[PDB]
């Protein structure tokens, strides 16, 4: 059955205003909260994966969303709460 899920919207105008590219925004959100396969390394002669992901305590609750920052073209660091609005909604965890 459907479960609650955290909808987060990126303000295209404010991001454009602050000089903060959308790619900087999304890859930050995803690699932090979802993690990112970056490349491979060699563990004892065996090639294995290299993931970057936020530490657990910084990707748990919606308040943690604010503590993540993206740099603008001018060089200033901008928090996520500047160009994002967030709500709750329901969706399926398993589409048949």
């Amino acid at each position: 059955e459907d479960t609650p899920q955290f909808k987060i919207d990126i303000d295209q105008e404010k991001a454009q205003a602050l000089g903060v590219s959308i790619n900087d925004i999304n890859t930050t959100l995803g690699a932090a909260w979802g993690g990112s396969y970056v490349n491979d390394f060699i563990d004892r002669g065996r090639v294995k994966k290299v993931y970057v992901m936020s530490e657990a305590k910084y990707r748990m609750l919606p308040d943690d969303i604010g503590d993540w920052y993206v740099r603008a073209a001018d060089g200033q660091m901008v928090p996520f709460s500047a160009f994002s609005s967030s709500r709750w909604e329901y969706g399926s965890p398993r589409l048949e």
Partner: protein
């Protein structure tokens, strides 16, 4: 409380009006803060909204992000539920954690009738969200000719 949350999500009329007789908490909230009244406004169950409200359900309860049942119902085009909520004292200009009001949500989807019902009940047309946007700014940005005119 847990059985009332899931019965109001599924929409069983008889089971909510028996759990209420079993002393079930009208304002029992799930892990995201959604009361049975939030559930019924989201899913459009008009008559469970009317059973809970007369049983003392908090009409202006807000979730862990500031959304009230009036937000949900005005957002998804539940006209008759917007009117029943406002008839039981729904905060017409409630502000969530992003500054979004029921008028903003109803204006984004183009619900002309809920906008006219919120405005009739005194919705702040110049109310601003966290980005300074009014219901009007939404209208011109969406290209909504009909709604841009209703919003003054």
């Amino acid at each position: 409380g847990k059985k009332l949350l899931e019965a109001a999500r599924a929409g069983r009329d008889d089971e909510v009006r028996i759990l209420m007789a079993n002393g079930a908490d009208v304002n029992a909230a799930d892990v995201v803060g959604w009361t049975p009244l939030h559930l019924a406004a989201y899913w459009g169950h008009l008559e469970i909204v009317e059973v809970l409200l007369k049983n003392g359900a908090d009409v202006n309860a807000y979730d862990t992000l500031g959304s009230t049942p009036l937000h949900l119902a005005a957002h998804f085009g539940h006209l008759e539920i917007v009117e029943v909520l406002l008839k039981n004292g729904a905060d017409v200009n409630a502000k969530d954690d992003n500054g979004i009001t029921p008028l903003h949500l109803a204006a984004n989807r183009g619900h002309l009738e809920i906008v006219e019902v919120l405005l009739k009940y005194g919705a702040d047309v110049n109310a601003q969200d966290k980005f300074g946007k009014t219901a009007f700014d939404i209208s011109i940005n969406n290209g909504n000719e009909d709604l841009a005119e209703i919003l003054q």
